[PDB]
Amino acid sequence: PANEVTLLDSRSVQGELGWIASPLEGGWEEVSIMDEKNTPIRTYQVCNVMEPSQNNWLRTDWITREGAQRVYIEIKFTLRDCNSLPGVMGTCKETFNLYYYESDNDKERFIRENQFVKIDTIAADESFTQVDIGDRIMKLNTEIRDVGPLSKKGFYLAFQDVGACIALVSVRVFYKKCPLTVRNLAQFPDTITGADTSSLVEVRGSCVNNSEEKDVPKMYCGADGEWLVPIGNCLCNAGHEERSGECQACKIGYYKALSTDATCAKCPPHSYSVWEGATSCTCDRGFFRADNDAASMPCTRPPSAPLNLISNVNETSVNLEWSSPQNTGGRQDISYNVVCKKCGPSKCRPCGSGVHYTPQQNGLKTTKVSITDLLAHTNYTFEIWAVNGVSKYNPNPDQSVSVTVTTNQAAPSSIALVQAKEVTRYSVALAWLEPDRPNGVILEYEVKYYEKDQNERSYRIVRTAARNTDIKGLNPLTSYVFHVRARTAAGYGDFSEPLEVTTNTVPSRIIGD
Numbered sequence: 001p002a003n004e005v006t007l008l009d010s011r012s013v014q015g016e017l018g019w020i021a022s023p024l025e026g027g028w029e030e031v032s033i034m035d036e037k038n039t040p041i042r043t044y045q046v047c048n049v050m051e052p053s054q055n056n057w058l059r060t061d062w063i064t065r066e067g068a069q070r071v072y073i074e075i076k077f078t079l080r081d082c083n084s085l086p087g088v089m090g091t092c093k094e095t096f097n098l099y100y101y102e103s104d105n106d107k108e109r110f111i112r113e114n115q116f117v118k119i120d121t122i123a124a125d126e127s128f129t130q131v132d133i134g135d136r137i138m139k140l141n142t143e144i145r146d147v148g149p150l151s152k153k154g155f156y157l158a159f160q161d162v163g164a165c166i167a168l169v170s171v172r173v174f175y176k177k178c179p180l181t182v183r184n185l186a187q188f189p190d191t192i193t194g195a196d197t198s199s200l201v202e203v204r205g206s207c208v209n210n211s212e213e214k215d216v217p218k219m220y221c222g223a224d225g226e227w228l229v230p231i232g233n234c235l236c237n238a239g240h241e242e243r244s245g246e247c248q249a250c251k252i253g254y255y256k257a258l259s260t261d262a263t264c265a266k267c268p269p270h271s272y273s274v275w276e277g278a279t280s281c282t283c284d285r286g287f288f289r290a291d292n293d294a295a296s297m298p299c300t301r302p303p304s305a306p307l308n309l310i311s312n313v314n315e316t317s318v319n320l321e322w323s324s325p326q327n328t329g330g331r332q333d334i335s336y337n338v339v340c341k342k343c344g345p346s347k348c349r350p351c352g353s354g355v356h357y358t359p360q361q362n363g364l365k366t367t368k369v370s371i372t373d374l375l376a377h378t379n380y381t382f383e384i385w386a387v388n389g390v391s392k393y394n395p396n397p398d399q400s401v402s403v404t405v406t407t408n409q410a411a412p413s414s415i416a417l418v419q420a421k422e423v424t425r426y427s428v429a430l431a432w433l434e435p436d437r438p439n440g441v442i443l444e445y446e447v448k449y450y451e452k453d454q455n456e457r458s459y460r461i462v463r464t465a466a467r468n469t470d471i472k473g474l475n476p477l478t479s480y481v482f483h484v485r486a487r488t489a490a491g492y493g494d495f496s497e498p499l500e501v502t503t504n505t506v507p508s509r510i511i512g513d
């Protein structure tokens with residue numbers, strides 16, 4: 001596996017591994033066993049089970065420990081049951097002994113007779129047998145033992161047969177490491193396991209490119225080569241976000257302003273980021289951000305012109321009313337500034353004075369202002385400007401609309417004749433005269449209507465340029481009241497006397513059928 005590093009494998013070793021036996025003859029014997037396919041595997045067998053005592057040694061070649069302290073030894077072997085051999089009770093054994101000795105000499109010519117250390121007496125437990133199909137062996141035992149802590153450049157493994165009936169099929173020697181990994185944006189290197197089978201090796205992580213440490217990244221390498229639960233983390237730098245084990249630049253159109261931010265966010269309305277790894281979003285053309293700001297908050301724009309600009313005049317005092325613009329851009333910080341003028345295109349200077357202008361004349365949150373005390377018979381002109389937190393960045397006169405007005409201009413008279421031209425079950429067509437004395441240019445007419453009955457009465461308004469209108473979508477057989485008034489730059493005339501019209505049962509020709 002990725003957590004094991006093989007120091008020796010007898011099955012890999014080609015062509016007579018070869019191993020020192022003592023005695024050289026009559027002890028452990030090398031013989032090749034045939035697998036399913038392909039090549040032979042060198043094994044060692046002895047079954048000297050009729051002898052009173054046996055001491056047969058077999059020793060590997062020198063094995064480097066590399067950097068390992070704790071080394072594992074996996075032995076696969078077969079064992080013939082003493083009971084299956086006739087009359088060998090008392091001589092025959094079911095175990096063999098395993099030893100090692102550490103050495104800096106990789107060239108030892110003879111098996112040592114003293115300095116070895118016993119790893120264990122190895123027994124085969126029957127119930128743990130495996131079927132090995134590859135080498136054609138029905139009952140194979142596998143036992144693993146471990147040694148350490150190892151301090152020298154290498155070591156020799158030795159097998160002592162005391163009188164068993166045994167074939168050593170394979171020997172694999174290895175150490176364990178926790179494999180290279182990335183955890184919480186910190187890299188942890190391949191780490192050789194500790195000195196004992198219980199050891200934990202503390203490893204400090206390194207921040208990946210390109211991120212910064214938040215809390216010191218640390219993780220334990222367990223002796224089984226598994227990492228334990230890490231602590232600490234690194235955070236992706238601004239303009240980057242965690243993907244896989246890496247901090248990758250924010251994708252086009254996306255941004256991350258601070259390292260403490262989780263992931264990349266798409267640029268908010270009317271801002272964009274044209275480069276990867278963006279920490280900011282450039283405002284779109286015609287769009288801005290106020291000094292009081294969040295780069296997460298969308299860019300905004302100066303509003304459109306205020307709507308339904310309506311003038312009323314009384315003597316020298318001009319009262320004005322308007323409505324919120326169609327496009328705020330948008331923000332709720334909108335306010336209005338009024339602009340006075342005197343002309344009658346060229347020149348038209350400010351009319352500068354100490355006038356009011358009540359309540360404000362600038363930075364105004366309401367839709368009304370009353371102007372008082374300016375001079376009497378002259379044409380003035382007003383611009384009402386819709387303002388917001390931006391527009392100091394791009395002021396334009398189309399953030400305002402104008403009304404030309406004449407002071408001391410009288411309001412128009414009332415209408416005094418309004419007629420129902422055609423009545424159907426759902427509609428009333430109206431027509432009316434111009435007022436006797438418009439006293440100026442008529443800008444539009446307003447029809448006001450409602451149900452005669454006060455309960456469930458809804459007041460509605462229709463505006464028109466012409467002197468007629470068709471009021472549609474009404475209740476049938478229902479009594480309604482209509483009034484009309486005209487507007488000029490001097491304001492509204494008084495409404496006409498009420499005209500009462502009851503819808504009838506005449507079919508609608510629009511609906512047909």
Ligand SMILES: *[C@@H]1O[C@H](CO)[C@@H](O[C@@H]2O[C@H](CO)[C@@H](O)[C@H](O)[C@H]2NC(C)=O)[C@H](O)[C@H]1NC(C)=O
Nearest residue numbers: 343344376377378379380404405406407440441
């Ligand atoms: C305010 O402006 C109006 C519109 O221009 C002026 O009315 C015009 O006056 C001239 C003569 O000065 C006439 O020839 C036009 O026929 C008028 N226009 C209209 C209403 O049709 C008015 O004179 C100006 N008043 C002041 C005091 O400047």
Ligand SMILES: *[C@@H]1O[C@H](CO)[C@@H](O)[C@H](O)[C@H]1NC(C)=O
Nearest residue numbers: 313314315316317319410411
């Ligand atoms: C002018 O406006 C005020 C508003 O209350 C009103 O009292 C006064 O009657 C108006 N003048 C005329 C000519 O009616």
Ligand SMILES: *[C@H]1O[C@H](CO)[C@@H](O)[C@H](O)[C@H]1NC(C)=O
Nearest residue numbers: 208209210211247248249277
């Ligand atoms: C981070 O450093 C690596 C080398 O470790 C370098 O190759 C790379 O350019 C850096 N990351 C960026 C900005 O792509």
